[PDB]
Amino acid sequence: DPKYSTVGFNIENSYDRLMKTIKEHKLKNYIKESVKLFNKGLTKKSYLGSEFDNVELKDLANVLSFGEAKLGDNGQKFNFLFHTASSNVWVPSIKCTSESCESKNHYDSSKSKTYEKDDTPVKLTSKAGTISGIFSKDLVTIGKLSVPYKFIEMTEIVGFEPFYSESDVDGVFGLGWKDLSIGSIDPYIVELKTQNKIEQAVYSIYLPPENKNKGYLTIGGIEERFFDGPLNYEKLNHDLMWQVDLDVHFGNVSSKKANVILDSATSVITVPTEFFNQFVESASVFKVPFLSLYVTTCGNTKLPTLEYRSPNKVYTLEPKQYLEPLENIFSALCMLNIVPIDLEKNTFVLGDPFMRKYFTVYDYDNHTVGFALAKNL
Amino acid sequence: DPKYSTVGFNIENSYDRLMKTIKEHKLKNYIKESVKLFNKGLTKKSYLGSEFDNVELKDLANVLSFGEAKLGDNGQKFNFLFHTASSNVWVPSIKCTSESCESKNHYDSSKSKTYEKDDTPVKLTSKAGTISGIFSKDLVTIGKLSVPYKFIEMTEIVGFEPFYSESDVDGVFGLGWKDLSIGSIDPYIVELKTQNKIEQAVYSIYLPPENKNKGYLTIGGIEERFFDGPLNYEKLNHDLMWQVDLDVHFGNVSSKKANVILDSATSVITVPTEFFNQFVESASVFKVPFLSLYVTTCGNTKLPTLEYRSPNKVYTLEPKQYLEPLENIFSALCMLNIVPIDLEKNTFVLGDPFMRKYFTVYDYDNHTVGFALAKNL
Question: GO molecular function, one example (chains A, B)?
Fold first, then answer.
């Protein structure tokens, strides 16, 4: 229905992936019998305490995808994944020599009335892989909104496997601030408003509480029907990141003036390792040996409400927003959707769990981020 | 049949105890699914490496018991357990006030024609518990052999529970050198020979390969029928211990001039902790989390032959003498009958596993210990 322009997207989540592995490696009974042991409790040994760096920040990325975006006059179709920290949109060239590219949808400048050359070259060089290509300008549509935007047409794609090959994803659409170019190419959402296609350079994410494979992106205004109560804005502590200054308390474990990043693409709440150990130690939480898995009774009376405090608002997360049931492994068993991981100093991220509770707003004009209590729809 | 005097005794072993616990705590499937995990092998984590001091030397004691020894003229019956390091025999007094004593057989000096007073008091003060009592002299019989021996009649017994209460054992019979008294009370076996009831102060242990609940003690001579090949003697490195000087090699892991103690009452081969870690590391051996249990495929091709070298003889143990099948938990699964434990510096013990292969001789006269290849009877 909405009066502002809204798209659905699909999510592959951490739970879906963990379920996959448990079936690959036949792990249900090992988890079942470990938990029983714990309940008995013949696991006095903690430590547990297992320094599993299995965690890098990319291990925790969900894939948020949609296939109703189109390029140029002819409307060439592409499956993007959203990335919340990047300003640019990225799409395989018809010219792409690599093998990764063979099974994917392609941009063909030749086939588009609206196409303009730019031809400025770009290389993105990374940990997981490397991408070469060139800027082109064409009609970028979603699907009520449309604008001539400068995007990247990728010619060499190496790495990112096996995900890229196994994924039906073509490229990346940018809901962020960082532009690779030095031509000050604005965000897609900035450009819509520059060209007057919307009225404000803003968007929201709405993650419905009851469907963890779905999300909704709304562009150009605040859709009042997704939330109850007031919207609170916090000011960014960074020019180029959806990042905010807050004091964080998990029970008596606390950290003041923490950098907290909003990324609905992350699958969990993250916390520095020290902080996590203070939290989990004697909180009745069980680290299953040889797995990146923390587990507890879903009704655990020791688990605190998590708090993210600003000078005028506190955002909270009860145990039911940070625990995922595992009813098909063990009755009343849940896992923790909290992972320990050290990034920059004193840096935390709010992923999927936080946004299932809070509807969120991402405001390029006013350099703010907005929080409100999601409805259940 | 034998020409020298021979008694059977029963053994409760480590395997019997471990089986008990697995049934108490319902652990079969946890062990099964852990091993599967290992086989997969999703247990890259070693360390494993779990410093379980669950091990003290007493955790590893088997109980070797028999009930055909008798005291005095009237032949008062008692269930002893053998202890290989103690010279004295120990038995509850009829006077014993403690509760431990209530269910046990009792020595009543009054009821014995042959009894002589000694009345010299003795206290044994220990880690697990404390024993007070007094020396008495009476006819100590087993059951072809008999001699007036001075023994201890215990009046206060505190501690040693819950084993003592749950055990049908009354007291302790000493196959060792250490006499608590200062009256130079010889070993029971010395005294037999002093009084000419035997011809040599010697005994053997024969542990049959195929019945791990049974052992045989022979007193006063060498029973030729228990073994094949020659007897080798090593000289004790200690006046009061069944202890011997040897170089020990387990594969490339080695230790020269080690103190190795012969104790068939110990349930395992022991090894210092450092030595054990060097041994087990990349030997394809799996420490089951939260259990004092090391586990491997019974056909493991990496396991070496264990070597105990003297200047003129080496005693060896193949993997089939140091591995116990667990066929009723997992097919072709075995456990290691080797435990890490640091005692004195460079000190090792040969328990049940070694003696299932080697028939052993314990020679008080010549201050030697004798080794030979056990028959299977």
Answer: aspartic-type endopeptidase activity
